[PDB]
Write a protein that binds this DNA or RNA. Structure first.
Length: 244
RNA sequence: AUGGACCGCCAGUGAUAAGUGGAAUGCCAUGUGGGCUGUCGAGCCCCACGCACGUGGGG
């Protein structure tokens, strides 16, 4: 069981440890984010129990790391002296000091191939194919890849990440095989981070620590696509035999 | 419905005033394009007259 989401598109930003103006993202997706996306695809309002999404497994193969960019983001500026974002007491600020400036970072031009393995994976897949809310990647303004769900049904999808999945073009030496690609499994762990989601309600966001271990694996060089227009093509023909 | 949902960095601006590329210069000295030559029967149809050899009219 399981399916292979294809995390790609113009921009991605999985945030963490940022409860102020300055927002930051991780160099790889976080289960809280994509579990929020499945939850958004199944129609569970914030505050509902998320126990159903427990018992899931997410190994993610990073195709390209992508470069980090900072997004400057001012909110409430230029508006007249009687329209901004109120204060808790209700007394607005002076228009010269009214707007609030947040500089939210984001990860750009990267593509990940996650491998979901869970008991509810089939309904999750069928929910992503038709959701009850626009599914996004990190934040609402980021639009996901069209091929959000690369392969809908595969037994042992991890083996599919280790072999027979298209990769974007990169420098490959002559008649060289064994090109390394990093994938994260969850001793010899890399880091601990607040990912497991316990509650999404806006009144009390509650998360917990989760282990992460990045293993650099080797893949045969027969997956690297060509210079341009070849990668998207090869992945289309790859998603073509999904019916078969 | 994802440390996310809502969300503008942004309202003003001459790059400006001045300027010869200029004075000098044979592309030249040499060449057959040549031998050879008479311009003297399948066509598609109609009609008319016919000595069944043909003759003329309209397409």
């Amino acid at each position: 069981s399981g399916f292979l989401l294809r995390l790609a598109g113009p921009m991605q930003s999985w945030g963490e440890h940022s409860m102020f103006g300055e927002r930051d993202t991780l160099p790889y997706p976080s289960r809280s984010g994509l579990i929020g996306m499945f939850a958004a695809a199944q129609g569970v309002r914030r505050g509902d129990p998320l126990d159903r999404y427990k018992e899931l497994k997410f190994t993610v193969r990073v195709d390209r790391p992508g470069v980090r960019l900072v997004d400057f983001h001012t909110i409430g500026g230029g508006l007249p002296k009687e329209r901004t974002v109120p204060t808790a007491a209700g007394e607005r600020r002076d228009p010269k000091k009214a707007t609030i400036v947040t500089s939210r970072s984001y990860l750009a031009d990267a593509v990940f191939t996650v491998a979901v393995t869970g008991p509810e994976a089939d309904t999750i897949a069928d929910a992503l194919a038709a959701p009850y809310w626009q599914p996004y990647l990190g934040r609402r303004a980021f639009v996901p890849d069209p091929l959000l769900v690369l392969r809908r049904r595969v037994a042992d999808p991890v083996r599919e990440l280790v072999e027979a999945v298209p990769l974007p073009h990169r420098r490959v030496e002559e008649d060289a095989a064994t090109v390394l690609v990093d994938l994260i499994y969850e001793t010899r762990t890399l880091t601990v981070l607040n990912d497991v989601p316990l509650s999404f309600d806006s009144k009390s966001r509650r998360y917990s620590t989760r282990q992460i271990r990045v293993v650099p694996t080797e893949v045969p060089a027969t997956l690297v696509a060509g210079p341009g227009r070849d990668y998207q093509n090869k992945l289309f023909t790859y998603v073509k035999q999904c019916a078969e």
